[PDB]
RNA sequence: GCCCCAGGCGGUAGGGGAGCGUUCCCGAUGCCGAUGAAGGCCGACCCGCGAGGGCGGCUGGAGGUAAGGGAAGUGC
RNA sequence: GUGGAGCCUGGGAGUGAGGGCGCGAGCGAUAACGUCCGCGUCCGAGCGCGGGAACAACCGAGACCGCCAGCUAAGGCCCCC
RNA sequence: CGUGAGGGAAAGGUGAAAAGAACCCCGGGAGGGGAGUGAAAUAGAGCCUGAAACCGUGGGCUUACAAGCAGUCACGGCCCCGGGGGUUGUGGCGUGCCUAUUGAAGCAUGAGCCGGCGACUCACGGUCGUGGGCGAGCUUAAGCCGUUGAGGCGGAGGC
């Protein structure tokens, strides 16, 4: 369905290709909440009443002192007491459904290939481990650098000599997720990326 | 031109100096001078010390003319008080402010 | 579409009912609880159910 | 995070202060009292906003009556012919006529008579 | 010359060559109405019954603008009813051009 | 059919809806910033119904951070 | 009889100290700003508005807002007003 | 602080650089004024900014026959900026806020004022609704594999 442009020394081949012809935002924005959600620390921690280094001991009696009653200084009330309902160490992960982050991905896919910016790739002739390798490669294959692209392949001599790229954002095939996908204006993939994502979308 | 000297951390109730100083407020140097040597208050010695070291401070840095020299505007900021304790009965105990005072002495040459 | 460009559908998210916040929320001084009892003090009631 | 109070309280505080200024003592220098008062404020203001009519209508009806009087008929006569009359011009015109213009709202007792 | 005019709901002594805010009118800027004229007050004073038959005064509208933000705030007590609202009310700005008898 | 038609609009407990603002994440290797950020003081100026927002003046001297979303130690 | 009417199904409630007034009763002393009920109303929650001088429930009347417009309600029209 | 076991503080910030103010003057000194360093010194060491409470100092209005929950409406006067802003002399109206209450202006409770902290959350289950995915199917946990912010595998198990 969406035509895939295929970038090689034998010129510019194409792809049929079969996505998910209709895009559906909110699906999108879940799958990207998913992966921020879980990949927070979630080391907020505070000091409850119990938690925190004072003592037990009442501060003054109940009655016939004319100050307010008080418990121990370690109270939420006191300044230097601990804190009421204050963040504990707590996970944000939860497992998105696995249908839900696959066809996710491929609507992604679908979203910067139906729109023009998408670009698999044959091969890396160019690039060889060196940057500016990858540099005259991507301005030869096209690229001047104001397209944050999405690189995605298993040519560790390919990601290694462009990550330092600021406007490239390196991926092994594996890594493939729409986060970094919708991050890019263009995306780039290796055909055996293309494969593994066919496989991940199978 | 106007002249000023200021008795900054002045150890001495502010309200009590206040009436001292309020007491040659637009007045000639010479008047107030005097004034000051025959005031019976504590404030009116330290009031007297800023009165005329803003007169050298008029005479020499500014360089004012000594005879027009007048009170043009003096007044005393409240500095910051000395929290001392004062052992009251039955066991209590209070907190007196041994307040400070910044004195400030504002000169002009009245003309005519 | 840009991560600027991603949105929950309309009402897929919601706010809070946030108590305690004046009176301009309408949920202000009581958390909904009511005046005086068991049930809004904290902690509240027991095993409703049963 | 933690979201301590920032910046907020204190704006709030300086909005009501600057709404406060002109208040007898504490009432424009205490964000508390402040407060009350311009509630006190506002309720006077909705209310007077209601009374202020009435209240020029009292006016309108006093210096109306006043005039009339000047030409033999009180208040309430003078209301009946005009109504009579066919008429319609309200109190406050006619307070302005009465002030202003003594043959115009001469005229006007003229026909307010002139119903009877 | 003046003459009482309603408009609003109002009555407005107006002369020519008068600046005379009214209720929001429906005009374009520019424009310019004709008013029921309660009474002509003048030399021939004439009195509406309970309008001036053929008369009418012609106002160009200056134009729409809004009232000072009166700040409608009401408030009960022991309740806790706190009412804040802005308010502006529109108006619709005018010149007396002349009086038509 | 954004506008018109009719009707409604006191309000505690309470139920519901709709927004404002604070800290922090994405936007952001971005953008604003010594021609001055944040912050402070001031405005009779503009926006909003309001929560508030701009804008302006002075202080301040170095950070601030959009649209659009998310998460709370969020509004005294 | 189209009404912020009705019914059903679900979620969330608060409330479960009420009070005054009228009427019909009990108790009381045919006393109580009393108590306890029924019918109703108002306040509560309408200490928003006019009158009753002042006054929650008595009389009028249900406060979206603005207007230096008009008509009335109870109540008033000798001055305050 | 407590015999003691034990309780338990407060308290950070000049400046890029001390360049930390020579020296003069007043002063017993302190402190101050000059000078000087400095981008800046109301950055001067009690030092980034510096709010409010509070305190005073100058100016504008106003006030000594006068009644008041402090306001609000009108009018007028004055002053200021150029139609507005400040003050209020008069007249009208007007029973603080919170809680708790049938009922509070209440002579019921709380608060001296200011500034800051301060209270409906989290987890895991259930149930209702809802935004989406799939749908007589839905769906993974532990763990494994990967990056080291990348996810996938994992069907055990549950409904």
Redesign the pocket.
């Known amino acids: 369905v969406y035509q895939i442009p295929v970038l090689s020394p034998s010129g510019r081949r194409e792809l049929a290709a079969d996505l998910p012809a209709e895009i559906?935002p909110?699906?999108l924005?879940?799958v990207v909440?998913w992966?921020?959600?879980?990949?927070?620390?979630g080391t907020?921690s505070?000091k409850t009443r119990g938690e925190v280094?004072?003592?037990g001991?009442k501060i003054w009696p109940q009655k016939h002192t004319g100050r307010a009653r008080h418990g121990?200084?370690?109270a939420?009330?006191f300044?230097?007491g601990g804190?009421?309902?204050?963040?504990?160490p707590?996970?944000?992960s939860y497992?998105?459904?696995?249908?839900?982050?696959?066809?996710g991905?491929a609507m992604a896919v679908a979203d910067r290939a139906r729109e023009g910016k998408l670009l698999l790739v044959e091969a890396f002739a160019g690039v060889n481990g060196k940057t500016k390798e990858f540099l005259a490669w991507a301005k030869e294959a096209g690229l001047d650098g104001s397209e944050?692209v999405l690189l995605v392949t298993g040519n560790e001599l390919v990601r290694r000599a462009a990550?330092?790229?600021?406007?490239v954002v390196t991926?092994?095939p594996?890594?493939?997720?729409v986060?970094?996908i919708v991050?890019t204006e263009r995306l780039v993939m290796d055909l055996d990326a293309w494969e593994v994502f066919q496989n991940?979308i199978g | 031109m106007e002249?000023?000297?200021?008795?900054?951390?002045?150890r001495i109730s502010?309200?009590k100096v206040?009436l001292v100083v309020?007491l040659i407020?637009g007045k000639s140097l010479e008047e107030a001078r005097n004034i000051l040597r025959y005031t019976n208050k504590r404030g009116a010695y330290f009031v007297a010390?800023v009165l005329?070291?803003?007169?050298?401070?008029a005479?020499?840095?500014?360089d004012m003319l000594e005879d027009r020299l007048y009170v043009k505007?003096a007044?005393?900021?409240?500095?910051?008080a000395?929290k001392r304790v004062l052992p009251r009965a039955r066991g209590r105990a209070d907190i007196i402010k041994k307040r400070?005072s910044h004195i400030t002495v504002i000169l002009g040459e009245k003309h005519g | 579409m840009?991560?600027?460009?991603?949105?929950?559908?309309?009402?897929?998210?919601?706010?809070?009912?946030?108590?305690?916040?004046?009176?301009?929320?309408?949920?202000?001084?009581?958390?909904?609880?009511?005046?005086?009892?068991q049930?809004?003090r904290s902690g509240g009631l027991k095993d409703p159910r049963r | 995070?933690?979201?301590?109070?920032?910046?907020?309280?204190?704006?709030?505080?300086?909005?009501i202060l600057?709404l406060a200024?002109?208040?007898?003592?504490?009432?424009?220098?205490?964000?508390?009292?402040?407060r009350?008062?311009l509630?006190?404020?506002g309720?006077?203001?909705?209310?007077?906003?209601?009374?202020?009519?009435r209240?020029?209508?009292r006016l309108?009806i006093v210096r109306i009556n006043a005039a009339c009087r000047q030409h033999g008929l009180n208040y309430?006569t003078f209301?009946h012919g005009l109504?009579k009359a066919g008429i319609?011009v309200?109190?406050?015109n006619?307070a302005d006529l009465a002030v202003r213009e003594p043959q115009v709202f001469a005229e006007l007792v003229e026909r307010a008579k002139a119903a009877q | 010359m003046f003459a009482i005019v309603k408009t609003?709901?109002?009555?407005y002594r107006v002369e020519p060559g008068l600046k005379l805010r009214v209720?929001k009118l429906d005009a374009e800027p520019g424009a310019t109405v004709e008013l029921p004229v309660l009474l002509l007050g003048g030399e021939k004073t004439v009195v509406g019954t309970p309008v001036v038959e053929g008369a009418s005064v012609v106002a160009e509208v200056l134009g729409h603008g809004?009232?000072?933000?009166?700040?409608?705030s009401?408030?009960?007590?022991?309740?806790?009813?706190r009412?804040?609202?802005?308010?502006?009310?529109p108006y619709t700005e005018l010149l007396i051009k002349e009086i038509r008898g």
């Open positions: 559906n909110h699906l924005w879940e909440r992966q921020l959600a879980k990949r927070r620390r907020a505070t280094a004072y003592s001991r121990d200084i370690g939420p009330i300044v230097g804190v009421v309902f204050g963040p504990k707590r996970d944000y497992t998105l459904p696995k249908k839900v982050r696959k066809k991905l944050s990550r330092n790229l600021p406007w991926l092994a594996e890594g493939l997720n986060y970094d991050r991940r | 002249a000023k000297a200021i008795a900054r951390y002045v502010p309200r206040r309020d407020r010390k005329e070291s803003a007169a050298a401070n005479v020499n840095n500014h505007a007044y005393v900021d409240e500095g910051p000395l400070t | 840009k991560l600027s460009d991603l949105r929950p559908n309309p009402g897929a998210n919601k706010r809070r009912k946030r108590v305690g916040r004046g009176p301009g929320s309408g949920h202000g001084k009581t958390a909904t609880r009511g005046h005086k009892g049930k809004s | 995070p933690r979201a301590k109070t920032g910046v907020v309280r204190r704006r709030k505080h300086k909005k600057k200024k002109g208040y007898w003592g504490l009432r424009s220098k205490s964000f508390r009292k402040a009350e008062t509630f006190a404020a309720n006077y203001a909705y209310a007077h906003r209601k009374r202020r009519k209240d020029f209508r309108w309430s209301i109504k319609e309200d109190r406050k006619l | 609003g709901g109002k009555q209720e809004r009232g000072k933000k009166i700040l409608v009401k408030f009960k007590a022991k309740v806790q009813y009412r804040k609202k802005g308010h502006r009310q």
